[PDB]
Amino acid sequence: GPLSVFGDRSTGETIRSQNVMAAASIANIVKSSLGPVGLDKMLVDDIGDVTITNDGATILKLLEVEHPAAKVLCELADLQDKEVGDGTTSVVIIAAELLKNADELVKQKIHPTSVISGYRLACKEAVRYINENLIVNTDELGRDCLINAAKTSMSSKIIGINGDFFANMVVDAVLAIKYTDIRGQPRYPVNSVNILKAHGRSQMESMLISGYALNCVVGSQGMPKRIVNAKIACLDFSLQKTKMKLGVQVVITDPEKLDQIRQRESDITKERIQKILATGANVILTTGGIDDMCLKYFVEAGAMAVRRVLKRDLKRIAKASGATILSTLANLEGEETFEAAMLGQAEEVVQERICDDELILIKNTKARTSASIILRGANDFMCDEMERSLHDALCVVKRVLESKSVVPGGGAVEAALSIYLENYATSMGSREQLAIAEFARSLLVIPNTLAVNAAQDSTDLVAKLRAFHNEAQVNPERKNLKWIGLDLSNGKPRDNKQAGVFEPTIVKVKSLKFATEAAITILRIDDLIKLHPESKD
Amino acid sequence: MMPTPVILLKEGTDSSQGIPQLVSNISACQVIAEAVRTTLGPRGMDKLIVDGRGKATISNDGATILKLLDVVHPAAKTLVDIAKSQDAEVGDGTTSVTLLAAEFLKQVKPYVEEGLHPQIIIRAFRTATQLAVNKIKEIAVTVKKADKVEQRKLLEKCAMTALSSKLISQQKAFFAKMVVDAVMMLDDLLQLKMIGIKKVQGGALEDSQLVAGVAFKKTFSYAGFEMQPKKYHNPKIALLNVELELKAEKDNAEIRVHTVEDYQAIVDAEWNILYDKLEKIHHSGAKVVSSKLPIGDVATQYFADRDMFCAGRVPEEDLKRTMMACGGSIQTSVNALSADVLGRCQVFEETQIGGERYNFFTGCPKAKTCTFILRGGAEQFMEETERSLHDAIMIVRRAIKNDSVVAGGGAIEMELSKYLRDYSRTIPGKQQLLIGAYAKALEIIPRQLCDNAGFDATNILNKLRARHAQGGTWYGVDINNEDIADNFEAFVWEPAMVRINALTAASEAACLIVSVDETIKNPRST
Amino acid sequence: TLAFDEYGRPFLIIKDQDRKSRLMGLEALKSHIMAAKAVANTMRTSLGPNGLDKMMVDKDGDVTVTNDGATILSMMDVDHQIAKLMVELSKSQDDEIGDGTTGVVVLAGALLEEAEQLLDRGIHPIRIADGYEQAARVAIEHLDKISDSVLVDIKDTEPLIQTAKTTLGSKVVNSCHRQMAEIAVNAVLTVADMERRDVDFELIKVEGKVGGRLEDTKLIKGVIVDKDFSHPQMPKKVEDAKIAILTCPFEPPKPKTKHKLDVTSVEDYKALQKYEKEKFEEMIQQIKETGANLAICQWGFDDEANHLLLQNNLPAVRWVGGPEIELIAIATGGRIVPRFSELTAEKLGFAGLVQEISFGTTKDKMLVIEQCKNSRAVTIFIRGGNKMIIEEAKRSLHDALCVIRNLIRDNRVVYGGGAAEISCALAVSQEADKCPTLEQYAMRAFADALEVIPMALSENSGMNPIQTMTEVRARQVKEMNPALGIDCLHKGTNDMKQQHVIETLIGKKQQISLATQMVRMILKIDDIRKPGESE
Ligand SMILES: Nc1ncnc2c1ncn2[C@@H]1O[C@H](COP(=O)(O)OP(=O)(O)O)[C@@H](O)[C@H]1O
Ligand SMILES: Nc1ncnc2c1ncn2[C@@H]1O[C@H](COP(=O)(O)OP(=O)(O)O)[C@@H](O)[C@H]1O
Ligand SMILES: Nc1ncnc2c1ncn2[C@@H]1O[C@H](COP(=O)(O)OP(=O)(O)O)[C@@H](O)[C@H]1O
């Protein structure tokens, strides 16, 4: 008679109501961590680890989910870090409210393919309207655009101070790693900034190290820990005793030739260490291993040798100091040449005190003048929060300098799109106009969440918010009310042009493209079959 | 991990707080509204609920379905009590009260998640309800030519729509004619105990009938009932409350005798006590005897020899209907029997309807009661037919004392959305998002008339909002044709107090769900 | 999600909702058809004269072989609420008419099978149910076309015997197909009131005793009770019985209340002996003064009263049941007397050969009443080879007693053997085109389901269903439609008027009416709220 599957089958409006409650179970979590009045959470594990964070990606990655519609919204937050980097609480609330308003349409016996086709006409028109209603590029504002866009990202986190201490350190970090490319591409690789953590003084003592901050120790306590006018030798091979390979064995037939082979394992080893040290090299960085026999040659000659450094850290030092990453001997059948003209340069390599640990600093690197940020917090829970908040702040200034276009934040984009799409649904709307009209109400949840978390008036402040944006579209008298946002500290609509509340363009363009595409896949689960777990057979 | 005291809070109780509590109450009312959602409209199906004992009850009434779900949710019990009060006040407002009260919470469900302290929602719900119950009274039509054939036609149209959405398809013209004729035979009290609805298994719905008199089920008799033939052209009924047995003992009598000459005189006196009571029933014309107390083998054979009929162990609910049918009086003592206490009928026979025997009375013109015998093919079929009969009786019971009727279907629920949206555009403040949300919540009654049979319900609401804003105010949803139609001209009528008590009970239930902010449950459940 | 909210709170609506079962879907209507078709496919093989019986085993281990559709569905342990409505459907046909209890379940399963293909085309289930009411109305009006009977209950019993042979032809009484058919005709006409057209089945006592054969079943005009002569030397044959029916035990009169009679002297104790000695001589003389030679008593006898019966030549039975003596006073024309002092010659019953008959080696000795005088109560004595053939014959002959009762209620007949179902299927197909607006597909599904009952007779008779039905249905359109059906041995031609296959009009009128209304209550249901496990 029925289906003889050994799992479970649920059809109809059961799964159509379960996917909305699965998406609302995720959105109601992250609704309390949006905007400058948002608050952080606690993520406690079974082993006892506590993670205090408010970013939309760190919470949903550590949180376990079971529903298939819940894994779509959790993987939607992971894509926002790679594509944009701060846009990762706002996408989850929009994509869940896109399913909440579309559930009210399919309960009115409206076909979901008209809602899918109605959402594509509203998503492509939202990108078209936001690209024709921008204020200015990065020429008029200058450095004031980079600082004000950085403070908007920090307002939802622990580094949202009233001053410009953390804002100036981010702009000075991205501007110091300007790496040009072919065909006129000024790239800004923000992954080259080594963000370090140390439980020390307050947040106002966060050092901006112009150069690189290596997270390693010297090793042997007989080397000079401060070298002025240093020459960095970046190399990746273990400075240990000469061990033969698997194909080579030592089969001796004469007992007199025994001790000459035993001394040869250290003579070939020390032959490399004398030709890399006679060329003026004082700092040697190694990703392999330097044993206790080879540490004597640096104490005797007065050189610094750092062992077991990361491979991702050696590439950031050799590119910034002009050093060449050498793995072995080379240069056309040469015995030991080392190409001594390709040594790195540094002004000062100094191991400072980082509150009961050792940290090596390189000052200005003499070739590229890179930057590294050492964070200072109260405990380890604040340092993990300060690292995530700084990494999201580095991604904001990266997209502004690459794509010179900013949009007003604080719900100013979602207020203008809530009224333009209602007029867009009336012109060319015959049967898909109800999906475009619900696309505007789903976008209004971003200024609605700012009024809930601020404990302000909800149905009056957003009603006063769209009152200025309606007059900016139907009354062409140059009212300039396209930048009207929210003042959550006062509870009144303010102008985000003069207040300095700036967000990048692709933090809302890619947010509206990812949330609309995720809402289509969850809208097509009218039939769902769940099989039994095959564990013990 | 937070609460670890030495002395706990109360015992172990959990309590939600704030905005997650209120959405938990609104979404709970949406689940219990699905059990009355598919039972609306003439194209609405019924539901079958089986309990733990295995008893099946198939019905579509809101007062029958919601009482068998065994709902233990605190907020969802509010929608069950308004379905019970609608059956107690009106009788046919049941599925519409539960579903409309759930829409009052779902239309404010995006509003309660974003601010909007609920004292503004309670004030807006009470304001829109008082304007809704006043526009019904100002538009409900009435007549000034009653006590004629036109008033009986008004009672028949309200009973056909009350018999709609039931298990009756083509028997609307047959059953609803009997419902109007049932309440017109009653007195000026309209008591529901003055009409017997008895279910006889076997026969179609066309085999049912409305007896002008009464009829009982012919309960357990004794030897002598195959005699006493059932042909009476003008009998008299003796309603009694006495025992006609030889063993009538007062349970405290000790008859101490001394000799054998007086011992036989006691046994002869015990037969003379019973035979003197039978001589009082005799010599008075009372050929039919009815008593709620049992009759032994002695008085059964005495009436068979004197060509008299009797019936013992009659239920007390049937003797009260028998007293108002024949116009007599129940006499406990047989010494005061006369012509003023006996009944009078014309046709009294014992038929064989459905296999079981039934002693029916007919022919009495001064009949203040009636009996509607139901014939069906199943026990659950006749229980639904009895439940559908009570909804048509309680509609026509209230229609006599208040003949103000309105249009059926979604005609009133759509035009109340017109008068409330026009009122919401004339007041400032936050009430434009609440009075207008109250008007959009009333549009689900024409939605469930269409969603149960397709009908393209999105396009049919654009025709309803355009017709009510242009011309008449009684345009609703046609069931046979997939179009809008004037329900007042199509004789789809319902009394005005059906929708007045529906809007009043749904608003007071919706104001109670939004007013509770904490729910504390004690774990002691024994 | 279920049992949890989006805010983390537990979401409990009803009690024990985890162990519940709820189906709305599109398979809730599909589960009702597949549960009802398996009941109709079971009862399809037991239809017609070639219908094979079914063996039913009770919970106590008792085995009853039944063929009638009322007792088959009633003795099942089916815990399915859709199939439980098919049990009450066959019970409602037995309580009202009592002949088509098998055919009303195959017809209801045929209407649901044709509605399954109509459900996949997008038709609403109430629209199919509203289309079946407009289609069954044509079958009622077309069934009243050819209907006539000439029964006068004097000498024209030939339409009454041939009507009962159609009911008894499908049972296991075909060996007594002519003998037992005449028993059920004469048993109804002697007890029926023709002035009121009312038949009382309490006057027809159906008794059974193992032994003999099926041909030894006789219609005893009178009563058959278990004779309990307290004296073993009582005469076992009374030629002319003046029956004295009484309801008082042969004892000194005991009151109904507490007495505690006091004895003081020895003159009072000697008065106790003379009181009882004269009481047993008074209760015996008051019967002999009326001229009676037979006594019936409901209660027991005393040992002192037993020998006084033999001295006065007065046979008497002991410990007769409640409704058993009620049948004696009607069969003999006597009156049931409460006391002994109210005995007279007018309250005596008249009977002829009053005797007891021993059956083989048993000690039952039932009463046989041969001669009577205008009795209104008969007793059928069913004999057989085992208790399986007797309890079935009690159920088979009860269906034969009901079809004679339906002829007194309505003297209109039809012709069975599938002849009325093919003729009614042509009436719905002719009115399906007048007009084919909305319910065209619902009426053609009714006519295709009415042809399942005659094609089930062709399947049980070893023929082909679609080959035989196409030949019979085409012959009713080319000419005026006769009583044209089928049979097992086929009796030569297929004319039901010549083969004397006669069924009642109101029997088939309630087969279409009850199966349509039961289909409407199982099509107008879109949810099931059954629980899970028992505990
Ligand atoms: N000063 C401010 N005034 C008003 N709104 C602000 C201000 N600063 C930040 N916001 C709002 O807070 C929101 C924070 O979003 P966020 O959680 O950072 O997104 P993501 O998770 O993608 O990084 C932004 O959408 C922005 O509109
Ligand atoms: N002939 C008809 N045409 C259109 N709609 C109808 C017709 N008959 C009844 N209805 C609708 O069916 C609905 C039945 O409601 P009902 O379940 O009886 O309410 P309650 O449960 O309060 O008695 C009514 O609201 C009415 O509008
Ligand atoms: N001699 C015959 N020729 C053809 N058909 C017959 C003959 N005798 C009986 N039948 C058919 O056998 C069927 C038996 O139905 P039955 O099972 O007795 O119905 P129910 O269960 O209601 O008593 C009848 O419908 C009748 O048409």
Ligand SMILES: [Mg+2]
């Ligand atoms: Mg039969």
